[PDB]
Amino acid sequence: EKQVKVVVDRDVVPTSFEKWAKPGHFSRSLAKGPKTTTWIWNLHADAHDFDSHTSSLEEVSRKIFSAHFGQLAIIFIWLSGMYFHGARFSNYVAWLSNPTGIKPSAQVVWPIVGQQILNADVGGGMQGIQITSGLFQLWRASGIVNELQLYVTALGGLGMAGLMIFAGWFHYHKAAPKLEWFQNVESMLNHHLAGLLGLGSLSWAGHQIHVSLPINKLLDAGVAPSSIPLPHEFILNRNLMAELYPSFQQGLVPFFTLNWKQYSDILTFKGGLSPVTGGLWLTDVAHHHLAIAVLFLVAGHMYRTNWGIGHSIKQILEAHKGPLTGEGHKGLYEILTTSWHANLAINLAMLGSLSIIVAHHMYAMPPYPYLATDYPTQLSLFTHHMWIGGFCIVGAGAHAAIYMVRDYSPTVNFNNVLDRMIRHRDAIISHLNWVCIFLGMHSFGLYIHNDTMRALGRAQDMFSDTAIQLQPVFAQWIQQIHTLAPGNTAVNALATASYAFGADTVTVGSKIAMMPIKLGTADFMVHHIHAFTIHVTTLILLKGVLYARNSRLIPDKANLGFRFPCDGPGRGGTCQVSAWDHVFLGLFWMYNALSIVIFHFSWKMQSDVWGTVTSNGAISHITGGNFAQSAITINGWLRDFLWAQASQVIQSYGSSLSAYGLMFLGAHFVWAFSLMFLFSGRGYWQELIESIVWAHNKLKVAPAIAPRALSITQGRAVGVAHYLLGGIATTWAFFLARIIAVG
Amino acid sequence: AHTVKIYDNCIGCTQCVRACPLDVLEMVPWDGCKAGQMASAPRTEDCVGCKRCETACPTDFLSIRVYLGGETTRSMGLAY
Amino acid sequence: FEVSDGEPYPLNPAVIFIALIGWSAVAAIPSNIPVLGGTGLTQAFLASIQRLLAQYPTGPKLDDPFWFYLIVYHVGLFALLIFGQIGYAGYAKGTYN
Amino acid sequence: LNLKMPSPSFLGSTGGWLRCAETEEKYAMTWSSDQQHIFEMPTGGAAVMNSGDNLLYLARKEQALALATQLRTQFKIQDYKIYRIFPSGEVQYLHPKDGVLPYQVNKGREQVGRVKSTIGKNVNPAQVKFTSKATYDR
Amino acid sequence: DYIKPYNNDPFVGHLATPINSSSLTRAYLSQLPIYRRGVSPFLRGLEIGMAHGYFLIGPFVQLGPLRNTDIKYLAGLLSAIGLIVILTLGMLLYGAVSFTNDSQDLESVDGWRQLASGFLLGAVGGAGFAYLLLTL
Amino acid sequence: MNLKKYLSTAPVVATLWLFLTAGILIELNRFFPDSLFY
Amino acid sequence: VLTPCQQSEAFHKREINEVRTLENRQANYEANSPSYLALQSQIDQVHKRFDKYGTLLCGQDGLPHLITDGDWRHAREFTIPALLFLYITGWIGWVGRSYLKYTKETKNPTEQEIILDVPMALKYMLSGFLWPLSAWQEYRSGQLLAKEDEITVSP
Ligand code: CLA
Ligand code: CLA
Ligand code: CLA
Ligand code: CLA
Ligand code: CLA
Ligand code: CLA
Ligand code: CLA
Ligand code: CLA
Ligand SMILES: CCCCCCCCCCCCCCCC(=O)OC[C@H](COP(=O)(O)OC[C@@H](O)CO)OC(=O)CCCCCCCCCCCCCCC
Ligand SMILES: CC1=C(/C=C/C(C)=C\C=C\C(C)=C\C=C\C=C(C)\C=C/C=C(C)/C=C/C2=C(C)CCCC2(C)C)C(C)(C)CCC1
Ligand code: SF4
Ligand code: SF4
Ligand code: SF4
């Protein structure tokens, strides 16, 4: 039994500006003076690498706890900024009065160089830039009706940021916990499961029951936002809550008497989207938060902490052992308690996967009101969370490789799952590479074959609905099962979880909110393309992590480090052999996969879901059924999607969307500038810099800091950074301009 | 079959031999420096061209130069 | 039978029999739900098998309930088989946890 | 030498020597230890070196030398010998080839591959054109 | 414990896993036209070809460009025969460069030539048999 | 506690100087907009 | 051919088009309310800008074309801004060169380059207001151009 106690060191680090005037103080090599321009880049490259600074785990743990506080403060400042922008420079009240007619906007551009044109006529009196972040819908779902609440929330956010600033400084210069702290994974998990998530969802459920539910009910009943009672009135005067929800007449007595069924007025399970706003029923959302809170709270009492009751993660890990895995998960507990890189890899992979799942679930089941009708917001949110998820996944792979190169130990990883995997890494990577080849052929080859057939006039020999058909029978079957679930497998559910599986369509403000997303041959091919790209990117990352320590080409890659340029022009060439380079390649592949994924979502939504509905139910999509026969060929993807939909971003000049068009061009430049750093080497730039330095010497204007070219690894990093920035910015401007100009 | 050549500017610091991963270099007695030792490459057949020695050489201009010439199984670093 | 190289592997048909009987009995519990029609999934699955066997050439289409019964029955039966072999070899034969 | 020497307790792995090593060169490393240390095999994995004599086979000289480097660094083991075995069966002593580490100056070694003066005196490629001579050749 | 080195000797680039090596796996990999004891190269080639052409005809007849015409089976059979001829050409080239003059043991020029002849004859016969079955 | 030296470092001095330059340019552009051909 | 914009119909047409574009959006708003005043200021600025540009030369497209041949009549178009740019950038270059020359005289010039010496940096920045004159006398004294520098093989 180990005491889960708190031990801290007081005044461990002094608070002074002495170290601010000595850049590179955290590194022994960087504290001796630059001597070259490469030191400037190395200073920032190794600034947040706390593991390279010192060899003590305690110091790294403290440098992480702090700086986590700093990032939390940065997030709180950003949130406060969003709330203040909504309260001061946004048409939030006007939007509340007419959510469908008024375009959300919370940014006002200053009139200086003709940029005042960017202030679009979003309505509501004010003119500004239309925001697609969903801030307006979220605030409405939270019960915000006046800008005073937005101002108070902004002030509270600023205060929380100040608190997260003080906490970060206090936990590094006034009270720094010892390594025994931070190694209590059982206590940290129990608290995060029952306090950070469990109690958090419980509190949010309470807020929704007492604020979101009544305010939104009155809003959806035709009551003006100014005439709705204040949130505190619903708590003080129980008569109002009783009138809006008779369940409140019984009070909390039913909860304590197990007569939970009496809460059918506030805790419903309707299942579908609200026909008035198009979003999920707030009652179902509150009931969902209550259930997730109770489930997380119960889950938070699993591990053992300072008491006999509970579980030991190490015991559970070591208990799992089988014939095909000699030692099972033995030694993994010590791995996740002595290396922050391993924990960061697992957490980054899970956080990225969670973000991707969030994107899918948010578009399919619009949670906020009027979110579905605001297609710009829907496109931006799905695409945004999809991108952040992919970036976090690539980062997860990078940190896994980092741990493998630096924190790995043969004694700890002996005959366990990790060691057993490293033993047969060749089978893993060759079989996975074979899967990638098969997927690419059977996914992209289908598209290429269709291009060849259509060009030859042999349309009868294509992979389409009319010609050879490839129907996702399994996915279509799951959709049908979901369509029939509300009556045979969900007895208490009154409607399908998502109308995208089937049921009927929902229209709000003469606009389609969510209708069944039928899958055909085009969806079959695109889904296989998605799987192919995911397989190749995971192959690149897994290869980099498995061979991070050694390989048949370089027997001691670990000694060379995780981030090294190459072993030289030997053994035929060992360029981009380090794991860091594998992450560098995985970034491009993740970008390609994610770009294709967002492209499919955008086109499919604009051709089969998003659109207008005329009286009597007639439906007219933005691109009427063109995805069925145009998404099956690369030519169609270039003509009906990249060319047809780009007209909005190229013709945006002279209007409020001109900025997007400008960003559309700028991004291209950046994407084309990255090529400079990707198809070139530092030897040539060093020679060019030598000639330029001679020119400077001829005028006695040479700098003391010897100018040097970017390192090989730094050059690769700059190239990938510019490539991703340009590509994501181009598709960002294209998506936003296309969705704002139409729909 | 890469050609490794040692020049007279060698200071006998042994860093090239210490950084060579194929036992291609060694130290032999010499009288051109106070160290009394000079780098030698009597096993160039095992060299792969990684140039770790070139990187580990401290002289102004590398006293050890590796020229990539004939390619064989050893030089290609093929374990298959 | 040898699972790998010269190491023997204990195969017991009783494992399959016990897994099949246990899963059939567990799935034979009636449920007044429209998909199952007031009977266990085992009875419904067997009934669907007979119905589809009558029309041997034509197989079940996407809207046929047979697929749901098949997936659930196989999910549970395979789970009992896998967990059953784990329990028999790991504990009964001494292969260890 | 001593092909019957005991081998470290390893559980296989898929990174060991392939068929090419059977029909071609195959390196071997034989070292002695006093404690059953755990070392990372150059092929990927973890092994326990038998207390006493340890003998293992590899497909590359660099792999054996890297293993020797880690045995000398992670552990204070300096009596590591690397041999080469051909398909015919004749063994060849490769490392250290003289009982002394290469970076340790030792008598009896003849300088090989020496060029007079610095590289700045190398002849131009035009002066040795159409001839079996190189710039580094004096 | 089931995963062991292939030859019980570590440091080998292979592992004796369940499907990799097992009673059932060793029996199945063995006895095949190839790897079976007491089978001449021509017999192995004949069996392999008659087993390959049979399933090779299927794709061409079912999804060939002329799959909808009345000569879909004939066109597919001709396509399969052509593919078989190309494969036989590849086999013969491989035997010509990889193997030298020695005893006929499937690893010599004569052995691989006999194997290629058997493969071609078997593949053509199998394709013809499958075509006959489809027509009937 | 030498804050002056830190404020004198390359990033801080560069950002301050560029901020002042941009501010001067912007202020000149609103007081004297669409300036062309002097 | 080029004609003054004040006498070109294309220029007036463009001015009217811009005014119309602004007025179309201005009509939606109300006289005294947020916005509508924002568009009136833009219209006034458009009028002033076109009246200012009327002196420039433009062809058929009506876009003001700038003559850079060096004609005195068009000095304000390119000559004057060109000279002012050269003065500003020569000032920047000369102050930078002098600061580097001073830093090279310190104990650790690298530290000065990283952590700029605001006192001396400002001392050289404030000066140099006569950089064209300072460039000379440095050249005449031979303190500007160097004699021997770093050169690789095959000079
Ligand atoms: C962390 C989440 C959270 C938080 C902070 C709150 C916070 C609050 N809730 Mg609440 N609530 C939540 C979640 C949450 N809730 C959830 C998940 C549910 C289920 C969906 C409810 C359902 C609920 C109801 C129905 C009510 C509240 C009420 C309240 C407020 C007073 C509670 C109270 O003590 O009254 C105590 C009330 C009692 C009846 C005490 C029970 C025992 C008494 C002593 C019986 C003995 C008889 C006696 C004579 C009293 C007669 C009462 C009878 C006439 C009803 C309070 C600010 C109450 C309120 O103020 O409405 C605005 C209210 O009626 N909540
Ligand atoms: C799926 C059915 C099932 C389940 C859940 C179990 C579970 C268990 N068996 Mg058992 N067994 C089964 C079938 C099953 N058995 C059958 C059919 C046979 C006959 C051959 C046996 C014969 C057998 C023997 C001889 C022994 C066991 C023993 C055990 C226990 C040892 C640990 C273990 O096996 O792992 C599982 C441990 C758990 C705690 C369960 C965790 C489950 C996870 C969290 C979720 C599983 C979801 C699952 C896949 C859902 C499937 C779909 C569903 C519709 C069925 C364990 C609690 C041993 C024992 O008695 O304990 C000492 C032992 O001696 N079993
Ligand atoms: C129920 C108790 C509890 C709660 C609610 C939290 C909550 C949190 N912890 Mg934490 N932790 C706890 C107990 C708890 N912890 C214990 C007992 C240990 C030791 C075993 C740890 C050790 C620990 C570490 C090492 C780290 C965290 C981190 C975090 C943050 C994760 C980042 C995030 O998701 O943003 C969500 C943010 C919010 C929702 C804002 C809420 C913030 C308020 C102030 C609630 C937190 C209360 C705090 C735990 C205790 C107050 C102390 C009091 C003296 C003032 C989050 C705020 C990480 C972090 O970010 O570092 C700062 C991290 O590095 N925790
Ligand atoms: C919670 C997420 C998280 C965290 C905490 C870390 C933490 C860390 N990472 Mg990691 N990483 C992450 C996510 C994360 N990473 C993701 C998502 C990726 C994929 C992109 C990576 C890929 C990655 C690599 C390849 C490496 C690290 C490294 C490191 C370590 C040193 C970082 C450093 O000092 O560089 C300093 C940081 C900078 C100099 C900033 C670079 C700026 C880039 C270009 C982003 C620009 C964004 C911005 C929006 C651009 C537009 C604005 C522009 C116009 C100005 C450190 C412990 C390095 C390491 O382990 O050391 C060996 C390492 O090599 N990370
Ligand atoms: C968009 C693609 C692109 C661009 C813009 C450039 C641009 C350039 N290349 Mg180049 N190149 C490219 C692709 C590109 N290349 C590719 C694919 C290859 C094949 C590998 C090459 C290989 C190559 C070689 C071998 C060489 C060049 C050279 C040059 C420079 C030539 C001199 C010049 O015109 O300077 C003018 C500067 C510009 C055109 C850049 C515009 C100015 C920027 C935007 C201003 C500064 C940033 C600004 C403040 C905004 C950022 C703010 C910040 C907060 C983010 C120039 C900067 C030559 C060179 O070095 O010249 C001396 C050189 O020898 N390139
Ligand atoms: C890689 C994607 C792909 C796929 C799936 C297809 C598929 C097809 N193409 Mg096509 N094609 C492609 C790419 C592709 N093509 C590209 C990129 C081009 C442009 C160069 C073309 C140009 C093209 C033309 C001009 C034509 C076709 C035609 C056809 C059809 C008949 C082709 C045929 O008879 O092949 C023969 C196939 C085989 C001999 C064998 C296939 C492999 C077998 C089935 C794998 C079995 C493995 C097995 C499961 C392993 C385990 C077994 C073991 C354990 C026992 C067919 C549906 C024809 C048509 O009319 O369209 C309908 C036609 O005229 N294609
Ligand atoms: C950095 C260069 C710079 C320069 C050279 C100027 C110069 C000038 N500004 Mg200006 N300003 C700047 C930056 C600058 N500003 C910035 C970054 C902002 C914020 C976006 C402003 C906002 C601003 C406003 C609102 C006004 C001026 C005005 C003026 C003129 C008034 C006369 C004067 O001599 O005051 C010299 C002023 C300065 C040297 C700059 C001081 C700016 C301080 C911080 C005041 C701004 C307070 C702000 C509203 C709230 C807090 C800001 C925060 C940074 C602390 C003037 C010549 C006034 C004007 O239009 O004249 C009729 C006026 O109304 N400025
Ligand atoms: C003391 C500052 C300084 C001075 C006096 C010069 C002067 C000169 N440079 Mg140079 N340069 C500088 C900084 C400076 N440079 C920096 C920081 C860079 C890296 C971006 C370069 C990169 C550079 C290249 C690539 C080339 C020159 C070239 C030249 C020569 C021709 C003009 C030219 O092309 O300029 C070009 C100027 C730039 C590309 C950017 C200048 C950067 C900023 C805006 C100015 C420096 C500000 C400095 C920090 C001020 C210090 C003030 C001090 C009091 C604190 C000329 C003698 C050319 C040459 O080789 O000669 C024929 C040439 O090709 N420079
Ligand atoms: C066969 C029925 C499963 C349907 C296939 C999809 C299952 C999804 C899980 C993925 C892993 C595959 C399951 C076998 C794997 C499995 O569970 O085996 C069983 C075994 C686990 O049993 P142990 O006795 O080792 O248990 C002890 C430890 O697990 C302690 O928890 O796992 C292995 O040791 C081998 C791991 C992968 C072996 C290589 C297979 C790689 C192929 C991956 C592709 C899978 C098929 C793709 C879909 C068509
Ligand atoms: C993957 C898979 C599989 C597969 C299977 C198979 C594939 C089977 C079979 C089979 C086959 C693939 C067969 C074939 C065949 C053929 C035959 C049976 C034939 C024949 C005969 C004849 C009639 C002949 C004739 C001739 C002539 C005419 C002359 C020349 C020579 C010869 C002899 C050729 C399984 C189910 C396992 C599992 C799952 C899936
Ligand atoms: S210099 Fe560049 S190309 Fe050459 S070996 Fe190194 S990383 Fe590879
Ligand atoms: S190139 Fe590499 S292998 Fe060859 S001598 Fe130099 S260090 Fe040794
Ligand atoms: S070649 Fe270089 S590293 Fe080797 S001994 Fe001579 S000077 Fe030292």
Q: How is this structure best described in words?
A:
This is part of a larger assembly, with 7 protein chains of 7 kinds. Chain B has 80 residues and is of the alpha+beta class. Chain B has one domain. In chain B, strand 2 and strand 3 form a beta hairpin. Chain F contains 2 helices and no strands. The longest helix of chain F has 22 residues. The interface between B and D is large, with 41 and 38 residues. The site of 1,2-dipalmitoyl-phosphatidyl-glycerole has 7 residues of chain A, from loops.
Summary, kept brief:
This is part of a larger assembly, with 7 protein chains of 7 kinds. Chain D is an alpha+beta fold.
The amount of helix of chain F comes to over 70%
- Which ions, cofactors or small ligands are bound in this entry? chlorophyll A, 1,2-dipalmitoyl-phosphatidyl-glycerole, beta-carotene, iron/sulfur cluster
Number of distinct helices of chain F: 2
What gap, in angstroms, lies between the N and C termini of chain C? 22 Å
Question: How many E-type strands of chain C?
Answer: 2
Q: Give the radius of gyration of chain F.
A: 15 Å
- This entry's quaternary arrangement is part of a larger assembly
**β content of chain F, as a range?**
under 5%
The biggest sheet of chain F amounts to:
none
Shape of chain F: rod-shaped
SSE run of chain C: EEHHH
Distance between the termini of chain F: 48 Å
Tally of alpha and pi helices of chain C: 3
Estimated share of beta-strand residues of chain C: 5-15%
Main location (chain A): plastid
Binding site for phylloquinone (chain A): 685
Binding site for chlorophyll a (chain A): 676, 684
Protein name (chain A): Photosystem I P700 chlorophyll a apoprotein A1
Structural topology:
This is part of a larger assembly, with seven protein chains of seven kinds.
Chain B: E1 3-7, H1 15-19, E2 26-29, E3 37-40, H2 52-56, E4 64-67
Antiparallel strand pairs in B: 1-4, 2-3
Chain D: H1 19-23, E1 26-33, E2 38-40, E3 46-48, E4 52-58, H2 61-73, E5 80-85, E6 91-95, E7 114-115
Antiparallel strand pairs in D: 1-4, 1-5, 2-3, 5-6
Chain F: H1 3-7, H2 10-31
The complex binds chlorophyll A (8 copies), 1,2-dipalmitoyl-phosphatidyl-glycerole, beta-carotene (BCR) and iron/sulfur cluster (3 copies).
One chlorophyll A binds at residues 202-203, 205-206, 209, 235, 238, 241, 248, 250-253, 255, 263, 266-267, 290 of chain A.
Notable traits:
part of a larger assembly, 7 chains, A: 743 residues, mainly alpha, two-stranded antiparallel sheet, two-stranded antiparallel ribbon, 28 helices, 8 strands, 58% helix, globular, E: 136 residues, 2 strands, 62% helix, 3% strand, binds chlorophyll A, binds 1,2-dipalmitoyl-phosphatidyl-glycerole, binds beta-carotene, binds iron/sulfur cluster
